[PDB]
Amino acid sequence: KRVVKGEKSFFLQPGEQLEQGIQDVYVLSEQQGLLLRALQPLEEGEDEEKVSHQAGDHWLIRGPLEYVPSAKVEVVEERQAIPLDENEGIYVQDVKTGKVRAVIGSTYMLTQDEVLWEKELPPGVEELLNKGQDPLADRGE
Amino acid sequence: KRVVKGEKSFFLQPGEQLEQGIQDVYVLSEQQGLLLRALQPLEEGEDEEKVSHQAGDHWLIRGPLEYVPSAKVEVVEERQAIPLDENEGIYVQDVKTGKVRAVIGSTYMLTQDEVLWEKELPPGVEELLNKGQDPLADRGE
């Protein structure tokens, strides 16, 4: 395969074929991210540094930038951040280890190897959490 | 593409085409603003300074001026200010962090990365806020 991008016009020479038509590039705000897996060992030096991936890896792409998918890379998931007030939070689980924790405070984008963990409650505690906002008359009788 | 603006008349040469017809420019009062996103990295030095944007950014355009959209810029939203008396206010949320606050006083235009946050109340408090303007006879019996 061969990936062609940009303001460019050309002829499909005989033998060639477009894979999935004319596709449009991924522009991303700083509230948006891409999860994407490597099919083959690759080297992508977009900036001065060089990230080197293995043939099964994942990584996350976040920020305000325009990304065109390489031929060796597969896009897995589109991510957004999660907006959190101070004294709000969510429970995330690092599935590489298992360590579920609570991230609380600023807005947060789950990185690679993180998934949302549900917290489960004993029977009747959930009915007491919401009533306790103003349980006045209940407290009365 | 190519953006043509002004008192000007010309012929569409063969091959060319207008995108969406003859369009009219955005004139804006100082109570009106535009939210608009960058598609590609751009440089727009309208004044002496130079704002440099990335390929996913947002920014806000406010004031009394006439704005014609560039080819690299996309208009996202038209904003107005919100008129506020002293000791009135609204709850806005900076979604880049999450920090919901209360802006109170002068009239206010939500900048980039701000959205309105709803404040929710316990059951029965809302019925007591409005009755307390003159709760005379209720207080009596």
From Swiss-Prot, chains A, B:
Post-translational modification: Phosphorylated on Tyr residues after EGF stimulation.
Top-level taxon in the UniProt lineage: Eukaryota
Tissue specificity statement from the Swiss-Prot or TrEMBL entry: Present in most normal tissues. Higher expression observed in epithelial cells with secretory and excretory functions, as well as in cells chronically exposed to xenobiotics, such as bronchial cells and cells lining the intestine. Overexpressed in many multidrug-resistant cancer cells.
MVP repeat start-end pairs: 26-81, 82-141
Induction: Up-regulated by IFNG/IFN-gamma.
Stretches of the chain forming a coiled coil according to its record: none
Extent of the signal sequence: none
Cell location: Cytoplasm; Nucleus, Nuclear pore complex; Cytoplasm, Perinuclear region
Domain notes for this protein: MVP 3 mediates interaction with PTEN.
Biological role stated in the UniProt entry: Required for normal vault structure. Vaults are multi-subunit structures that may act as scaffolds for proteins involved in signal transduction. Vaults may also play a role in nucleo-cytoplasmic transport. Down-regulates IFNG-mediated STAT1 signaling and subsequent activation of JAK. Down-regulates SRC activity and signaling through MAP kinases.
Self-association and partners: The vault ribonucleoprotein particle is a huge (400 A x 670 A) cage structure of 12.9 MDa. It consists of a dimer of half-vaults, with each half-vault comprising 39 identical major vault protein (MVP) chains, PARP4 and one or more vault RNAs (vRNAs). Interacts with TEP1. Interacts with PTEN and activated MAPK1. The phosphorylated protein interacts with the SH2 domains of PTPN11 and SRC. Interacts with APEX1. May interact with ZNF540.
Identification of the protein by name: Major vault protein
Gene: MVP
Shown part of the complete sequence: 299 to 439 of 893
